[PDB]
Amino acid sequence: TPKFKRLPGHIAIIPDGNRRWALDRGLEKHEGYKHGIVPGLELYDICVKIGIGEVTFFGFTQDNTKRPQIQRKAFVDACIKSVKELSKHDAELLVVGNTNSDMFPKELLAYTKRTKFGKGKVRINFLVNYGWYWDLTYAIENIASAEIPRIDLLIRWGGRRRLSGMLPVQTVYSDIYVVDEMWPDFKPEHLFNALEFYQDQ
Amino acid sequence: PKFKRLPGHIAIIPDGNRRWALDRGLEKHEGYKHGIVPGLELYDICVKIGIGEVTFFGFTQDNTKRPQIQRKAFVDACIKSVKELSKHDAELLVVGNTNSDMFPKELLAYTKRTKFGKGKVRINFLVNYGWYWDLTYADSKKMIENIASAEIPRIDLLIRWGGRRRLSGMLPVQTVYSDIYVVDEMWPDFKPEHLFNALEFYQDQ
Ligand code: DMA
Ligand code: DMA
Ligand code: DMA
Ligand code: DMA
Ligand SMILES: [Mg+2]
Ligand SMILES: [Mg+2]
């Protein structure tokens, strides 16, 4: 770990590129999501080691649930597994999203109140059946995502330079770092590169 | 140059005027007058290539807290930019907090979209703008349809000069899906190739 002079208080993660990653390996589009679980756990372990206090993962949007059933079932399954795996570590977990929907996984309702697992060394938020319009209209201190603070640094995998409607209130001033590799090809150097960028701003 | 796909609506963040001035050995406030011609050049290129709508980030409410000599210069440059475009076929709209002593009175004529000449392109300017003012301006549908910037549509491509990779609270509703292109050069060092590069990037998305 570099001797950072500064870290972001709050990083947002956009774990994009799972379908492209799968197709490149000769898999079906829906098979990439299960390969995005261990990267999230590796990113959690780095954040705990270096002292990042809060991480928000973009799980899936309301628009994502319009995708074919086989893809929706796979990404929902992978999101559930991610939250459950992180609950075995020292994470204070919160899931934010539209629970008044058939598309919100019932397995994740338990985590819609921030829950401390183990030593609670990092706060981890997950956006699940999330939509920016749902978030803003829920209401500014009363937006649906009000428990999620301002983001310092947003890191997106899969090479697209856009927010895909992640938390428009919290991302107003965020520095944005884009990794061209797809999310399942996560490496520590992607996070370290983004943190060097952040402290150099 | 010829493009396969063009964005309907480009947003511009003309950042880096003070760094540009200090690099040229000038006083911090002297960069802003050198940001006007870059704006007119971009408009000219947009009219030529056929971009329908351009929104310029002029200045925020937070920017008004800068030293007076900087504020008078950047306000003056925004007014000059709007007046000049008024002479060249732009449909102009200025969005910002008019209920403030920091809203330039010379731009009150533009707070309802106005066609000049042939109205070849829709040009919007954010002046004395803040994201919080915008969203809170606002049933919950009638609210988001009634944000202060509601007459500014969704942005396809946002181009920012000065090398910072952030939105600085530009139009959070309209930038949710925008593709973002960052030019490392400061805004007064604008060249056509900066816009061409951003449009090659956009058509490849
Ligand atoms: C749930 C979700 C949207 C995951 C991000 O990857 P993706 O399914 O968008 O993959 P790709 O960007 O390759 O289509
Ligand atoms: C994990 C996640 C939600 C990524 C972005 O969603 P997307 O791939 O649907 O967005 P876009 O089409 O804007 O790239
Ligand atoms: C009105 C305004 C905020 C202009 C953008 O350039 P700047 O004055 O922020 O310059 P710099 O980024 O070099 O300080
Ligand atoms: C032209 C313009 C309003 C740019 C952003 O202003 P900034 O320099 O105030 O923003 P930041 O501090 O986010 O770089
Ligand atoms: Mg995607
Ligand atoms: Mg600046």
Domains and CATH numbers, chain B: 10-204 (3.40.1180.10)
Residues with CB under 5 A from ligand 5 (ion): A 16
- The Cα angle at residue A188 between residues A185 and A190, in degrees rounded to 5: 70
How was it solved? X-ray
Q: Nearest by CB to B176, from A139, A140, A165: name it.
A: A165
Nearest to A173 by CA among B18, B73, B164: B164
The residues, ordered by sequence, that sit 6+ positions from B180 with a Cβ below 8 Å of its Cβ are: A161, A162, A176, B157, B158, B160, B165, B167
CA distance A132 to A170: 11
CA distance B87 to B123: 13
CA A53 to chain CA mean position, Å? 14
CA distance B192 to B84: 19
Nearest to B55 by CA among B202, B204, B147, B159: B159
CA distance A175 to A188: 19
Beta-carbon separation of A172 and B177 below 8 A? no
How much of chain A is helix, strand and coil, in % rounded to 5?
Answer: 40, 20, 40
Size of the A and B interface in Cβ pairs below 8 Å: 61
Which SS3 state, helix, strand or coil, does residue A154 take? strand
CA distance B10 to B30: 27
Which SS3 state, helix, strand or coil, does residue A100 take? coil
Which residues lie with the beta carbon below 6 Å from any ligand 2 atom? A 14-16, 58, 60-61, 64, 160, 162, 164; B 177
Nearest to A168 by CA among A198, A131, A141: A131
Kindly state the tokens that stand for B152.
Answer: 């500014």
A161 and A178 Cβ atoms separated by less than 8 Å: yes
Residue B88: is it exposed, middle or buried by C-beta count within 10 angstroms (0-12/13-18/19+)?
A: middle
Which SS3 state, helix, strand or coil, does residue B119 take? coil
Beta strand ranges found along chain B (DSSP E):
9-13, 53-60, 90-95, 114-115, 121-129, 157-160, 179-182
Query: Distance of CA B16 to CAs A181, A198, B19, B98, B157, Å?
Result: 30, 18, 5, 26, 19
Which SS3 state, helix, strand or coil, does residue A127 take? strand
Residue type present at position A82: S
Question: What order of strands is seen across the sheet that includes strand B179-182?
Answer: B114-115, B90-95, B121-129, B53-60, B9-13, B157-160, B179-182
Question: What is the secondary structure of B144-187 as a DSSP string?
Answer: HTTSTTTTS---SEEEESSS--S-TT--TTTTSS-EEEE-SS-G
Count the helices and strands in chain A (H runs, E runs): 5, 7
Nearest to B91 by CA among B109, B113, B75: B113
Residue A54 alpha carbon to ligand 2 centre in Å = 21
Residue A44 alpha carbon to ligand 5 centre in Å = 22
Nearest chain A Cα to B169, which residue?
A172
CA A140 to chain CA mean position, Å? 22
What resolution in Å is listed for this PDB structure? 1.8
Instruction: Kindly give the number of the ligand 2 atom that is closest to the alpha carbon of A57.
Output: 1
Q: Take atom 10 of ligand 2 and give the residue whose Cα is closest.
A: A164
Residue type present at position A64: N
Best of A14, A62, A143, A161 to substitute, by most chain B Cβ atoms within 10 angstroms, is A161
Beta-carbon separation of B167 and A171 below 8 A? yes
Q: Looking only at Cα atoms, what is the longest distance across chain A?
A: 46
Residues of chain B with C-beta less than 8 angstroms from the C-beta of A176: 165-166, 180
Nearest chain A Cα to B135, which residue?
A140
Nearest to A154 by CA among A95, A194, A96, A97: A194
